[PDB]
Amino acid sequence: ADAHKVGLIPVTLMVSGNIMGSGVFLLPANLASTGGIAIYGWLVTIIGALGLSMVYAKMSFLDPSPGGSYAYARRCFGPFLGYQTNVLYWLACWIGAIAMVVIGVGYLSYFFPILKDPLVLTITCVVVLWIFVLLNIVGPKMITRVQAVATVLALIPIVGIAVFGWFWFRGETYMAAWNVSGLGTFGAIQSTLNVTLWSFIGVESASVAAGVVKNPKRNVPIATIGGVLIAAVCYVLSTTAIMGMIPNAALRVSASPFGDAARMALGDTAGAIVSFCAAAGCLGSLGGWTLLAGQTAKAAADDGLFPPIFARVNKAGTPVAGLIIVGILMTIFQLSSISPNATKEFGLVSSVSVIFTLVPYLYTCAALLLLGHGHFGKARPAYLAVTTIAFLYCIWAVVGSGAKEVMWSFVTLMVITAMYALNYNRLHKNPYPLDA
Amino acid sequence: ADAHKVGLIPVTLMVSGNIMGSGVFLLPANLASTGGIAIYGWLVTIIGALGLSMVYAKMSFLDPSPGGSYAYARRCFGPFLGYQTNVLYWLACWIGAIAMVVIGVGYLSYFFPILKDPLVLTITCVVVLWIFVLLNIVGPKMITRVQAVATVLALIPIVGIAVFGWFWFRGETYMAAWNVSGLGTFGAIQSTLNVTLWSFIGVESASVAAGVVKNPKRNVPIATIGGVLIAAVCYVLSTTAIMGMIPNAALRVSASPFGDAARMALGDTAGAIVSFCAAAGCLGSLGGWTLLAGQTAKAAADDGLFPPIFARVNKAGTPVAGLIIVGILMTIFQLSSISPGLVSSVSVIFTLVPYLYTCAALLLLGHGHFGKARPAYLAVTTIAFLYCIWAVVGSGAKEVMWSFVTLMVITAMYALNYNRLHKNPYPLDA
Numbered sequence: 104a105d106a107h108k109v110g111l112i113p114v115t116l117m118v119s120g121n122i123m124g125s126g127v128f129l130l131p132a133n134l135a136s137t138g139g140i141a142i143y144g145w146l147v148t149i150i151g152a153l154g155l156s157m158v159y160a161k162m163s164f165l166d167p168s169p170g171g172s173y174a175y176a177r178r179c180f181g182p183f184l185g186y187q188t189n190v191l192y193w194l195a196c197w198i199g200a201i202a203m204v205v206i207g208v209g210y211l212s213y214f215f216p217i218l219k220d221p222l223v224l225t226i227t228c229v230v231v232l233w234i235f236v237l238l239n240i241v242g243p244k245m246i247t248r249v250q251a252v253a254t255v256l257a258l259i260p261i262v263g264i265a266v267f268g269w270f271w272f273r274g275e276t277y278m279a280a281w282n283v284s285g286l287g288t289f290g291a292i293q294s295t296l297n298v299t300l301w302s303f304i305g306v307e308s309a310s311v312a313a314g315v316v317k318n319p320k321r322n323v324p325i326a327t328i329g330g331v332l333i334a335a336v337c338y339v340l341s342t343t344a345i346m347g348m349i350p351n352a353a354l355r356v357s358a359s360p361f362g363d364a365a366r367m368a369l370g371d372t373a374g375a376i377v378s379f380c381a382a383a384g385c386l387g388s389l390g391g392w393t394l395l396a397g398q399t400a401k402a403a404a405d406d407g408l409f410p411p412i413f414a415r416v417n418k419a420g421t422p423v424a425g426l427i428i429v430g431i432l433m434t435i436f437q438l439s440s441i442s443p444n445a446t447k448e449f450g451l452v453s454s455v456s457v458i459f460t461l462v463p464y465l466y467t468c469a470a471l472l473l474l475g476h477g478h479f480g481k482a483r484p485a486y487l488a489v490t491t492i493a494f495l496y497c498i499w500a501v502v503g504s505g506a507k508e509v510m511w512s513f514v515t516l517m518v519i520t521a522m523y524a525l526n527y528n529r530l531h532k533n534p535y536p537l538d539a
Numbered sequence: 540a541d542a543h544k545v546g547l548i549p550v551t552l553m554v555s556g557n558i559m560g561s562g563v564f565l566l567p568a569n570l571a572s573t574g575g576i577a578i579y580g581w582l583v584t585i586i587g588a589l590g591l592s593m594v595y596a597k598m599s600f601l602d603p604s605p606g607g608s609y610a611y612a613r614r615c616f617g618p619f620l621g622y623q624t625n626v627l628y629w630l631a632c633w634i635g636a637i638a639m640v641v642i643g644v645g646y647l648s649y650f651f652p653i654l655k656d657p658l659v660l661t662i663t664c665v666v667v668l669w670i671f672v673l674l675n676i677v678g679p680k681m682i683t684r685v686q687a688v689a690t691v692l693a694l695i696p697i698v699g700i701a702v703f704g705w706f707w708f709r710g711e712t713y714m715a716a717w718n719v720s721g722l723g724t725f726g727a728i729q730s731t732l733n734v735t736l737w738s739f740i741g742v743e744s745a746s747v748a749a750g751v752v753k754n755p756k757r758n759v760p761i762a763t764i765g766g767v768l769i770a771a772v773c774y775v776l777s778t779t780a781i782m783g784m785i786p787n788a789a790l791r792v793s794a795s796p797f798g799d800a801a802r803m804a805l806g807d808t809a810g811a812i813v814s815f816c817a818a819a820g821c822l823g824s825l826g827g828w829t830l831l832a833g834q835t836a837k838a839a840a841d842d843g844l845f846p847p848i849f850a851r852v853n854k855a856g857t858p859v860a861g862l863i864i865v866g867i868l869m870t871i872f873q874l875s876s877i878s879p880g881l882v883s884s885v886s887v888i889f890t891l892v893p894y895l896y897t898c899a900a901l902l903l904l905g906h907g908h909f910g911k912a913r914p915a916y917l918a919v920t921t922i923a924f925l926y927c928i929w930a931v932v933g934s935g936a937k938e939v940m941w942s943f944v945t946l947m948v949i950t951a952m953y954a955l956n957y958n959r960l961h962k963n964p965y966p967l968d969a
């Protein structure tokens with residue numbers, strides 16, 4: 104409790120918030136490239152995401168350390184694989200933040216065309232970017248509530264259709280466009296896993312924010328599973344709903360499919376509603392990531408595995424100097440990217456960020472078995488089945504990324520292990536030292 | 540000493556053998572795609588390889604554990620990063636052996652066209668493949684000698700030209716093709732590093748076979764550095780020598796540039812010589828890898844980190860059952876072929892991972908023993924780092940992707956096979 108921690112509801116909405124985020128609005132546009140067979144892809148993507156949820160759920164229950172993934176990998180494998188998880192996820196976070204502010208603010212252009220011009224867009228972003236760094240400095244009680252309101256604002260259309268969308272949905276349109284890809288059923292299913300497997304990055308959120316959730320052992324597991332269950336429901340119900348409402352042809356070339364789901368549904372400026380709700384979604388998610396950025400660095404900084412400045416806190420215990428760095432960085436790697444100008448662009452270096460997150464997922468399912476075997480009782484086979492699913496889920500994600508971004512993920516992994524060696528020799532503690 | 544270990548010379552020739560191997564004959568054909576500016580690429584590729592040599596040299600001096608890379612990673616980072624190194628490098632080895640038998644036997648087609656036909660080629664390979672598995676079962680004293688002879692047989696042409704090739708050398712020729720790539724100087728340099736940086740895979744050999752080298756602490760470092768020095772000398776002297784001997788135009792479309800080179804000096808039957816020496820090279824290297832395969836699995840098996848069967852030895856101490864597995868596997872993933880290289884490629888990135896964790900291990904374990912040469916050892920190992928990273932920077936993406944995916948599967952198997960036995964730096968209470 105004591106005192107400014109965050110409760111169950113905010114925490115869980117932070118999970119749903121970060122998960123659904125920017126993408127929930129573009130899904131039916133990308134599945135439309137393959138068809139209604141994307142339903143099968145979901146059934147596979149869901150049980151795979153429920154696996155990784157349960158893993159994080161049980162893990163955080165057993166050890167509710169602050170920093171989630173990072174924490175477990177330190178217990179399991181030592182300071183090095185700890186240091187690796189942080190650096191990766193910490194980047195995966197604040198690069199992820201950058202994507203939110205862009206996408207979010209970009210929805211607002213529907214209201215202010217003023218900001219399609221790329222320069223003004225970047226000025227607006229610094230502003231809104233620092234707005235949320237500041238909200239994060241007034242503390243996790245505060246941003247979790249701003250996100251909680253943001254994300255329920257963002258759920259309005261997504262339930263609206265998910266629930267009321269059926270009233271107009273039919274078979275004729277949905278089924279006609281069952282398999283537009285022109286690939287075999289298993290071919291298609293894989294081509295939808297390319298999209299949908301990245302839909303549940305975010306499941307870690309609660310377990311990472313353990314240090315700031317009120318009753319970690321009860322709540323982190325509830326927020327973890329619950330969050331993922333909200334996301335699943337929406338995804339499935341909403342994008343199957345849209346594929347029986349708008350014809351495939353129109354839908355796959357749509358910039359905002361929910362905006363179009365509107366212009367017939369409630370018509371007129373109902374796109375207004377959706378582009379506000381869409382913008383609210385991201386901006387909420389924005390702040391939620393920058394939070395999590397704040398926490399990993401904190402945890403790692405606290406065990407000597409990240410610079411001391413990230414461990415420095417104000418009296419409430421929130422890492423102010425830590426967040427101001429994330430804030431500065433995002434301001435640097437944002438001016439750098441004024442629509443070309445300096446060089447090129449660049450959604451590569453956000454894509455590599457998304458593989459950085461799958462590495463922690465992997466070391467966590469390892470950590471569950473390697474640390475947790477003691478506490479499994481007679482449910483041993485259950486926990487083996489589940490985590491191997493979580494494994495298949497992480498590998499099968501990378502199996503169908505682009506090469507280019509895995510290559511680069513891998514290169515940054517090498518450079519991470521070059522810095523550890525260079526920065527920690529002397530302080531390092533060897534399982535089997537040499538004598539002097 | 541006691542008793543059937545291997546001495547300095549065989550060890551070091553195993554190093555040079557495995558390094559130069561199949562590639563030393565194809566180098567000047569691939570550098571001919573860019574020109575005599577590949578000389579600059581070499582100067583960068585050399586000091587980078589002398590780094591990673593020195594690293595392995597000092598590491599194996601300090602700890603001369605059997606398994607080299609694997610050993611060090613276990614000390615440094617624990618059983619998991621140990622397990623990771625072995626599985627990788629063990630695959631790196633026996634996939635690498637498959638490549639050698641193919642290439643090696645393929646040179647012999649110059650004598651027996653009978654075996655360009657792809658079926659007969661694979662039958663031949665199983666035969667020769669199991670010839671060397673057997674030679675390896677009669678022990679490391681034996682294969683190291685077969686390799687030593689194989690690799691000095693393979694050095695004939697390579698010194699022949701490297702030394703005597705200068706008599707047909709022509710500055711005009713060499714210069715006129717200075718930069719055929721049509722890229723900027725730094726562009727060209729990078730386009731030659733693509734080839735040359737993979738030239739020194741093998742530096743690990745001696746430190747990996749520490750369990751079988753006579754006086755490990757003196758010899759593994761000598762064989763390590765010495766080996767790499769022999770490879771550098773040849774590479775540089777021989778391929779610059781050829782580029783002033785044969786015009787760029789001819790040279791870059793050559794199937795065997797040494798065959799063409801040699802036909803200028805000895806002439807006529809020089810192709811026979813070269814295709815025998817070229818085949819001797821690979822087949823020697825073939826056995827030397829299957830050796831190293833034998834040793835990692837042994838070392839890991841011995842620490843519970845690989846199946847017990849790989850730790851099982853005959854009275855001489857050599858892992859017979861272990862090698863028969865490698866032998867079977869190579870027989871399976873060979874008949875699997877017919878008709879009906881990526882894999883050989885992914886295997887090559889697998890070897891750069893151990894290199895990395897070794898330079899780490901040098902600093903993380905060795906800092907105690909650096910005395911007042913601290914800066915020297917930091918400078919050197921950071922080169923060794925740049926060398927490993929810069930290799931991967933210019934691989935194909937497809938084979939890094941797959942190297943990475945196999946890394947994930949490796950860590951899923953550790954979790955699945957070692958939970959209960961695993962020892963956590965910071966456990967939970969029950």
Ligand SMILES: NC(=[NH2+])NCCC[C@H](N)C(=O)O
Binds near residue numbers: 122125199304305
């Ligand atoms: N445009 C992007 N790829 N943004 C990355 C955000 C990832 C986050 N899991 C989401 O789906 O909302």
Ligand SMILES: NC(=[NH2+])NCCC[C@H](N)C(=O)O
Binds near residue numbers: 638886887890
């Ligand atoms: N074990 C391996 N992956 N070997 C690949 C061959 C590399 C070696 N430098 C050669 O060209 O001969």
